[PDB]
Structure 1
Amino acid sequence: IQVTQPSVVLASSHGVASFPCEYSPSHNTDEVRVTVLRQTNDQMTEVCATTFTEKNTVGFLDYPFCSGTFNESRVNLTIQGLRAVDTGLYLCKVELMYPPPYFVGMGNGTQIYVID
C-alpha cells in the first residue's frame, strides 16, 4: 500500500492543524490502523493511533489532541494543542489489519509549522 499526505501545513493561531492521509489501493471494507508520528532532528515518536473500519469511522476518541474521520480512501486528521516547539514533520503510518495479508505503509510526512 502507498500512503500520501500534503507536504506542508500552517497551524492556526490556536495550535490546530488539519491534513488528509490517503492510502491505496483501498476498499470500503478495509480495517486500518493509523498512527501519527512526529519527526524532528531525531527519532520518530508516536503522537496518537487509532483503528478504523467500514462502520467505525470516527477515531482517536481516546486522544484529546488528535481527531480523525475515515472517508473512503483517506483519513482526515486534526491535531490540536500545538505550540511552536511542536513544529516538525508529521508522518502517517497505515496498517491494513483486515483482510489478510497484512501490509504497512508510511507517508512522506506533512511539515507542520506552528508559530506562537
Structure 2
Amino acid sequence: IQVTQPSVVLASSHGVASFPCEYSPSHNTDEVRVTVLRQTNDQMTEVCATTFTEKNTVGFLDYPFCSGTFNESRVNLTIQGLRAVDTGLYLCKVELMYPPPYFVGMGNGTQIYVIDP
C-alpha cells in the first residue's frame, strides 16, 4: 500500500493550492475516502474529507474551501481560501473502501507555501 503526494506546492496569489494524491495498489472499481490533514506540532487538524464512488465526479461538495475529482489511483485535490498563516504541511490520506481487501495509507505531506500575494 502506498499513498504519495508532491513535496511542494506554491499556492496562487488568490490562495488556491491544487495537487494530486496518488495511491497503489489500484483497481478499476476503486471507491475511496480521502482526507486532508494539516500537520503541526505533534498533532493534525482535519481540513476536509470526502468519499468518491465514481470517476468524473466533483467531491468535497460540503466544504467551501476544498474541491476535487477522482479516477483510479489518483485524487486531484484543490484547497482554496488559503492565507499567509496557512502555509505548512498538508497530508493526504486515502482509504480504499471497495473492492476488498480494505486498506488505509497516508502520504508524507505536501508543503504548501502561500507566498505574499
TM-score (norm 1): 0.94
In 1: Cα distance, 2:99 partner to 2:71 partner: 18
Partners in 1 of 2:66 and 2:28 — Cα distance? Answer: 23
Does the 8 Å contact 2:6/2:20 carry over to 1? Answer: yes
Cα offset for 1:115? 2.4
Q: Could you say which residue in structure 1 is the equivalent of 2:43?
A: 43
8 Å CA contact retained: 1:28, 1:54: no
The corresponding residue for 1:12 is 12
What CA deviation, in whole Å up to 9, does each residue of 1:16-52 have, x standing for no partner? Answer: 0010000011012011100000012331110000001
Structure 1 vs Structure 2 CA RMSD? 1.3
Structure 2 unmatched ranges of 5 or more: none
CA distance in 2, matches of 1:21, 1:57: 16
Give the Cα–Cα distance (whole angstroms) in 2 for the partners of residues 88 and 55 of structure 1. 29
Distance (whole Å) between structure 2 residues aligned to residue 97 and residue 28 of structure 1: 13
The number of equivalent residue pairs is: 116
CA separation of 1:12/1:28 partners in 2, compared to 1, >3 Å: closer, same or farther?
Answer: same
> In 1, Cα distance between the equivalents of 2:38 and 2:5?
14
TM-score by length of 2: 0.93
Runs of at least 5 residues in structure 1 that lack an aligned partner in the other structure:
none
Is 2:55–2:70's contact at 8 Å kept on the other side of the alignment? no
4+ residue stretches of structure 1 with deviation over 4 A?
A: none
Q: CA deviation at 1:71?
A: 2.2
